[PDB]
Write a protein that binds this ligand. Structure first.
Ligand SMILES: CC(C)=CCC[C@](C)(O[C@@H]1O[C@H](CO)[C@@H](O)[C@H](O)[C@H]1O)[C@H]1CC[C@]2(C)[C@@H]1[C@H](O)C[C@@H]1[C@@]3(C)CC[C@H](O[C@@H]4O[C@H](CO)[C@@H](O)[C@H](O)[C@H]4O)C(C)(C)[C@@H]3CC[C@]12C
Length: 390
């Protein structure tokens, strides 16, 4: 009944854990507990769950040292189950030292994880779905070696089931692959979407499904030359657009009101949910795609590093978006962006895409709630099995 959550010390990981807390606490009267430092706790002071504090010990940070602190926290709570992240490393160890089942939560796509888990569990290599990853390539980094170890470990430490912030409609094939690879029952919980006025006032005065949202920055990388390239792409697309930047860089006084730029935080969920939106030029972050496909918005894939290229090519495989064609020197170009923007948002050829993103969206709003219901009842199963084990 009582569940405990230890999200990693990353804002890119706190929101899924908090939304999962809201989802599990509202059903089956789950006595909820969430453990993370006060700094990361006081940012989500909004709307059934109980929060916890954590004090580190003074003399990538000191999170690997809060072992005994979390041990005392668990000895205090003694919860029925712990849902940990991926980098705590000692969270399943401490959960076992208190005889608490540890369930691993993966806030990432299943195919990106399947690549690595299959490279690990099968040095017989091969890939059952090779339209994604193929062989006949050569690559080599201790940076990535540590990451992959932290990745496999948290995949093995999970008890029976592995929670994942994804759904079957996008990659149930890869979900079942991950299940058969890790020998654990992959239980999806769907996406976890949370939730000044000038943006709304401008977006309401437009036609339906004629505006393209852009947020390739998303608090990562964005150079002025790349700013110029994506700006010329947006301009020669002759389309209404709302672009959010991180921080010469164009002439907004010139192509104003046909578009709109924001310096920092935009209502991404509210913009994508608006009926006048029909495009999302994204960096292919997992949370971004999970939000985009929930509102029936196709995905212009401008990927770069990490798991984003795999997410983008998965979206292209399921036919809910399209990727930009990089130029000769491996860089997206004005035309490489405008081509796909026009072919997706306004062209009749991309209607297929435009339709699938809608046909999928309703499905997510049709089978909702029951995903997390089955996830909750599977957790009750593991706890009861543990008690029966004695
Ligand atoms: C083993 C081998 C032989 C080849 C396969 C690996 C691969 C093809 O890539 C090969 O990797 C090889 C490594 O040796 C090299 O040869 C070469 O680089 C390349 O070919 C690609 C494909 C699968 C891959 C994408 C992998 C990457 O590497 C490592 C990632 C990583 C583990 C990176 C950190 C990411 O976490 C976020 O990012 C920040 C840091 O945690 C956080 O702040 C943020 O919040 C998080 O969301 C998360 C989302 C967890 C992913 C999960 C997916 C994974 C496994």
């Amino acid at each position: 009944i009582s569940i405990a959550l230890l999200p990693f010390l990353a804002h890119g990981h706190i929101s899924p854990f908090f939304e999962l807390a809201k989802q599990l606490a509202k059903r089956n009267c789950n006595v909820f507990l969430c453990s993370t430092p006060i700094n990361l706790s006081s940012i989500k002071d909004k709307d059934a769950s109980i929060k916890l504090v954590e004090l580190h010990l003074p003399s990538r940070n000191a999170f690997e040292t809060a072992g005994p602190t979390f041990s005392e926290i668990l000895k205090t709570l003694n919860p029925d189950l712990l849902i940990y992240d991926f980098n705590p490393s000692w969270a399943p160890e401490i959960a076992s030292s208190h005889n608490i089942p540890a369930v691993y939560f993966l806030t990432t796509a299943a195919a990106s994880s399947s690549i690595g888990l299959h490279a690990f569990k099968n040095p017989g290599e091969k890939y059952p779905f090779p339209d994604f990853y193929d062989n006949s390539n050569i690559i080599p980094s201790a940076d990535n070696m540590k990451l992959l170890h932290d990745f496999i470990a948290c995949f093995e430490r999970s008890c029976d089931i592995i929670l994942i912030k994804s759904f079957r409609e996008l990659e149930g094939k890869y979900i079942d692959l991950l299940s058969t690879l890790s020998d654990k029952t992959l239980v999806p919980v769907g996406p976890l979407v949370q939730d000044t006025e000038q943006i709304i006032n401008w977006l309401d005065k437009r036609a339906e499904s004629t505006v393209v949202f852009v947020c390739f920055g998303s608090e990562y990388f964005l150079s002025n030359e790349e700013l110029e390239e994506v700006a010329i792409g947006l301009e020669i697309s002759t389309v209404n657009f709302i672009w959010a930047v991180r921080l010469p860089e164009g002439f907004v006084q010139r192509v104003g009101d046909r578009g709109l730029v924001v310096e920092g935080w935009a209502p991404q969920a509210r913009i994508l949910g608006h009926s006048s939106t029909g495009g999302f030029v994204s960096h292919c972050g997992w949370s971004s795609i999970a939000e985009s496909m929930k509102f029936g918005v196709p995905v212009i894939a401008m990927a770069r590093h990490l798991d984003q290229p795999l997410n983008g090519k998965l979206a292209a495989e399921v036919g809910v978006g399209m990727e930009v064609v990089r130029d000769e020197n491996g860089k997206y170009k004005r035309e490489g962006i405008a081509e796909v923007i026009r072919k997706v948002v306004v062209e009749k050829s991309g209607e297929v895409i435009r339709r699938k993103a809608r046909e999928l969206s309703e499905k997510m709003k049709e089978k909702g709630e029951q995903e997390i219901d089955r996830a909750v009842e599977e957790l009750v199963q593991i706890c009861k099995k543990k008690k029966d084990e004695q």
